[PDB]
A paper describes a structure:
In the second branch, 14-spoked oligomers of γ-TuSCs were selected through multiple rounds of focused particle sorting and refined to resolve the full ring of seven γ-TuSC units to 8.2 Å. The atomic model for individual γ-TuSC units within higher oligomers obtained in the first processing branch could be seamlessly docked into the reconstruction of the 14-spoked γ-TuSC ring, which allowed for detailed analysis of γ-tubulin arrangement in the cytoplasmic nucleation unit. In the presence of Spc721-599, the γ-TuSC assembles into a ring with helical parameters that are indistinguishable from fungal 13 protofilament MTs. Our cryo-EM reconstruction of the C. albicans γ-TuSC oligomer in complex with Spc721-599 reveals a complex that stoichiometrically assumes a geometry fully compatible with the MT lattice. In conclusion, oligomerisation of γ-TuSC units in the presence of Spc721-599 is coupled to large scale conformational changes that stoichiometrically transition the γ-TuSC into a closed MT compatible conformation. This closed conformation is stabilised by the formation of additional inter- and intra-γ-TuSC interfaces. Notably, the conformational changes in γ-TuSC units induced by C. albicans Spc721-599 (this study) and S. cerevisiae Spc1101–220 10 are overall similar. However, while the closed γ-TuSC conformation is stoichiometrically achieved in C. albicans upon Spc721-599-induced oligomerisation, Spc1101–220-induced oligomerisation of S. cerevisiae γ-TuSCs appears to stabilise an intermediate state, in which the closed state is sampled only in a minority fraction. While Mzt1 is encoded in C. albicans, our cryo-EM reconstruction suggests that it is dispensable for the formation of stable γ-TuSC rings with MT-compatible geometry.
Author numbering:
A (entry chain Y): 3 to 39, 73 to 120, 131 to 202, 211 to 243, 262 to 338, 340 to 473
B (entry chain Z): 3 to 52, 70 to 121, 129 to 202, 209 to 244, 262 to 425, 440 to 467
C (entry chain a): 474 to 529, 573 to 804, 814 to 869
D (entry chain b): 381 to 681, 687 to 723, 736 to 785
The structure:
Amino acid sequence: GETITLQVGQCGNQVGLQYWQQLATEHGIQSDGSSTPRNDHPELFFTLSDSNTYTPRSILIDMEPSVIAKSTSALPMFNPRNVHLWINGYKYGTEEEETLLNLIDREVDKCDNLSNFQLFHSVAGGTGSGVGSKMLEVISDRYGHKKLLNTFSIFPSVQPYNTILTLKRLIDYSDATFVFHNDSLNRIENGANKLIALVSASVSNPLRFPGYMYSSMESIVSNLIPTPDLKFLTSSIAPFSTQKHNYLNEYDMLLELSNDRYKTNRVGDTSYISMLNYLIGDNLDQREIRKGILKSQQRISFVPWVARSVLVVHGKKSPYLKNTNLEGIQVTNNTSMIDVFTKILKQFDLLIKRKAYLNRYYSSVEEENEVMEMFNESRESVKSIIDEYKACKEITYLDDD
Amino acid sequence: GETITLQVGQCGNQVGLQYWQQLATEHGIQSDGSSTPYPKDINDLQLQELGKYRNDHPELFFTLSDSNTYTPRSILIDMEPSVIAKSTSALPMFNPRNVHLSNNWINGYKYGTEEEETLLNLIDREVDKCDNLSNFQLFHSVAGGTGSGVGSKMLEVISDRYGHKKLLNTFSIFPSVVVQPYNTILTLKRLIDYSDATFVFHNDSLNRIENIGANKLIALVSASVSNPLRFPGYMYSSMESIVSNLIPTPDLKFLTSSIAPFSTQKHNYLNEYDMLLELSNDRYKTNRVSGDTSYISMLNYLIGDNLDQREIRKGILKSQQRISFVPWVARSVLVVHGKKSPYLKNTNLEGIQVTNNTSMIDVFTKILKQFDLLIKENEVMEMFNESRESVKSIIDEYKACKEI
Amino acid sequence: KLKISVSRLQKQYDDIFKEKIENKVGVRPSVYDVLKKNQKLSVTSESLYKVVEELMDEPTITSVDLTIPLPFPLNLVLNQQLSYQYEIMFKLLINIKFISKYNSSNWQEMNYSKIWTNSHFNSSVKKWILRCRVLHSRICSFIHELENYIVHDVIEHNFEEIKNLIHTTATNLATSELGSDINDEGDNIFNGSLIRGTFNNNSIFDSKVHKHRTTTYVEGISTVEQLIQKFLDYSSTLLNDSLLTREESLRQLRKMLDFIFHFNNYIVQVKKVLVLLNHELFNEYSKEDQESIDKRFANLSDTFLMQYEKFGENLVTFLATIKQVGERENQGLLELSNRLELCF
Amino acid sequence: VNQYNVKYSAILFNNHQGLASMTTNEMIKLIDSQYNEILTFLTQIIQGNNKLFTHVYNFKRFYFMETNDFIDAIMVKGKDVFNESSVNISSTYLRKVLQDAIQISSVKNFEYVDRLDSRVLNPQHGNLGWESFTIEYKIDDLPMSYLFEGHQHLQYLKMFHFLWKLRQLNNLLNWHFEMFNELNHNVVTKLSSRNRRPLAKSLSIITSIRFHFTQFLNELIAYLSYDVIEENFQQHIVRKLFYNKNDQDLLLNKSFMNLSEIDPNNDLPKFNVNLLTIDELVELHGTYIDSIINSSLLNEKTNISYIDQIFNILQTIFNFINTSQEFYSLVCTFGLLVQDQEDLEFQLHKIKRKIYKDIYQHDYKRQLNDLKNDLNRDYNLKDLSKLL
């Protein structure tokens, strides 16, 4: 089925520009939307006119026109009709609810069979994070739960308040949320949006370049989310490619994809809940992959109550990329989320006991009570998810004792 | 049949000039009246190695002279000569004989009454050139001065001089000053009494569409309504047949039109299926319509070469469920497969939707409220009372339309 | 099978597969263009588990088949025996694909449907839901592992050899002229060659020698007989590797697929029951007693436990069967046994 | 033909000594060359000078009702001639009607306006003009007329008859609308306020019933025109002639053989259209007509056919029109009056009751419900059932 991309905020718009440039390069679509000389299926991400032009399905949302202007000028094939221009931002989103609801309904009507909503946004984006938090609520309300949502939220490197307020709605409404940290991205680079764009583009490779299996997003996601509570994913990318000293075999890709240094978020000891590895090359040797799967299963520490299966998808490289060597992406579901969530909660508590900057949000007695109850609910939800991820680790998870 | 166009008032003349230039462009008739040779048909395939003949009906509007010169069937009525001078200069094809030259509605109405014989002679002269006349088209503004009074008097004169044996449309433009509400109600009284089908255009909603001039949109809608007549197809091809499909009773005669703006921007509609869904949007209707509206009749125009039947069928099926039909009217959506003029180089589709919904309750309510506020020889006050009662006579009727 | 109109599936398949855009006269059609319109998908009375038993209602998926008539002479190489072995694989793969599509949709509801995602359940129902979600996750992972083995470890891996061989043969023939010249001498042997009579003694040598040694597929396929034989061997490999050739493997596979399908149906019927348990949503759904609620939960306890233990039994038997068959005959099944054992 | 005779006699009798003195390979090659040349010239005539596609398009334009303006002109001009019995109509009146309708409509600029000709088929006493008039497109001046056997033309006149009835009713409803709308302004709105309200209500009821009937007829015509006639034309004529008839023999690329030579010569054109035999042309046009006449809705297959139900609804509409004329006369007699008032009011109530209850509620809604339920049993007609 078709997918709709939502871009919110300055960071979201920049990441989306890189993402769409990568996708258009992979499908050979020119900057003006004209084709270049089919077995691939860009229709899932591009709308095809009866004049042979490809335009992205994405929707651009931002508080200021400079970022949107840069993005549109860089890629002229964006449709201008889809362009629209913390608590203050969220209340502003309430005012524009009708316009945005109709704007999204236009894209849904334009496609034939909708599958999922992609969202590119930054949790630490301030006002834009507020408008994206409202976007999740309105979409989930109007379209129910038949269509799932995927959020490629960028985590932060007064900010604690914003991170908690955005994470409350991220937990409530998102169906499968990727976690990216600028710290680990710049550590890997030792710009940064080119890693997120690459990971997001590769995550959907089996859909755009069909093969024997994994033809739908339901199959890709369902392998990684045993419970709707544990919805945060850790993504790992192998950087050593296109150099002379590349990984010599896909088997070494499978073994060295699990290194903790390549993960896109700060990690000690972790337990894996689910696994799925992407291998993308013109030709793939099966016996190497079998040996690598066996070693990966014998090496990785799974939680007791999970089936303990490692899945390797055999992605196909784009014809428009000339004979490049193998590359691969790893997406995992770990219990390492407790560390980052604990860090966020510690910062939030430290800055909530001290009334440092709450004057910018508490306007009156009723506003004080409103913000206090909202903050308490967000804190309780985050603690609930931490406790759930902690109870997953132990062996008595399925016991009623 | 034949159609006679009458333009009254400055706004009416401004709209009519572009309406006639649009028609002349579609039919390949130059501004001097000279005709252009007809290009070969596109779907009339022919074997291949590897002048007066036509298949349209332009003469339904233009009088074809013995010297192969076309001339519109238009009559221009107003008092200020500047607009008429501009219109004639832009289009020399207009017949000078057809031009007639001379704020309070009463003054204009009395002027029309005193000089009714000359205008009537002009109408009869235009009719005499027509064999098997079909209908009259009126372009006038409900409020604005000359247009209101003169158009109302011409409405009455035409209605009673021919025994109402031919239907009479009305492309009225509603206003977006102390005298304006009086003029609006006074003209709407005669619109109720005499007009057979009224196309309500609201200037504020036209400005809302534009910012995404205002007369160009009116000209486009008016010149696209009659597309089946000028390019005959399987269905309709008669002005009475189109109107009769949207007017269930004489009272529910007020129609409103929706326009798809993006006929030229390179991000135009992908296909017919997309445009069928986009036409129902309330942001491009020419009359402000709320969410409590209900539709009495549906009619969609499609203008393009070799439209895909699968897309149209699927679009009709999807759009039928979305539309909220009045309980006592069967769910029916009709699509007109118009033919694009071969003279036009643009290959993009255009589509105009004409609807008969119940949103008129709010519009006439606003007009009535403004009139009531402003009210707070004696003959004129009696006419005001009569107009108030006549307007209420269809206010309550459109309200009752909701009920089985 | 009988509770649905057969003629509708044909049309709903042709809209997907054999859609067309025409081309002008003189423009050559592609071979894919020619073979698209040939194919026909029809429902047959012979179910998969019955038709495969011969060459040792149920839901319609068990009985939907696909046939492709072929032009002359292409049908001589794609002999009917080869197409029949292809059709069996089509039926098996459609069964597994359908179950995977039933495992994804049920996973969408189990996680995000309002009734399941409701927070206002009591602790007991919460733990019951958690157990059910974990069990369904195990079933999903098992099915994806089985499908991965069948499709990548059996079909693609074997097909690589044929693809390489056929490419080599195409390149070999591209440079080869059509028609070969044969020359001969005057053959003056006459009486030195007639050897008239009953016969010579050379007949014993012809029988003594053997010609069972042919390998290395040098310079690609050189005889049409080998061309047909390669594909027949490929189809036989596909059937043998898949768990359809032995009786133990086929029986275990049939039990496993039946159990998974019935579990999905039971999951669907569960959605109705959960409405009555919690109150916050029962009032909303009823718009259109403690003892009774306790009875409902007690019934669900035993039903869910039965499904859980049945899954364990089927898994144990299936692994044992694969292990014995892989150790005896098939190399491909042995590594699958190792992988599944390392899973659970 | 003479040039061809000389050319190929110079091969049979000069290059060789007859068919007997020819090896089988050369004889087959000669016959193949003759076949290609002959069919090339047959195309260059039939689809060339004769313009087969243009005349088939005109057949579809006129017989299948496409130029609705011309037929509206005929019906408005002949609204009095067709009223009398089929025996009374003479040739001169038909010619006058046809010429007036040609001048009024847009066919006067049509290229082949001369070929048009009207006729009456069966001048029976019991048949009115509407039940016998048929428009005939003369193609006798071309050799193409010998390919098109009379059976095809008879099936072209049957389908025209059905479509003619439908459009006759569609236009009668327009005249009904105009006359009642004019009467509303002339009588009802000027009547005394005491009895204006009941008459206004009755008139509104009548006009709403007319609107319902018009919607039904328009949907039926739209379905036929843009799903049966147009789809069949584009699928069986345009796609057979101009697009490639891809076949299993066209699949084989013979250029794997060296085949450096080409025959008969570069002088023989390639013609952008499939080379069809005479029997192939006859079969092509026969199948194109048969598909339309024997469509799903128009086939003869409640143990009743769809055509019978449609015709029953059409008879309902005819009865409605005939009774509405009586209502027209009674209300205009009510207008003229302003003890007779009570009698006229009673008759008005009786007529309104008859039309509202019997014709609409008792007959039309019941028949339409049965027809809608019948259509849902068919996959093809389910979509039409939802609208119609």
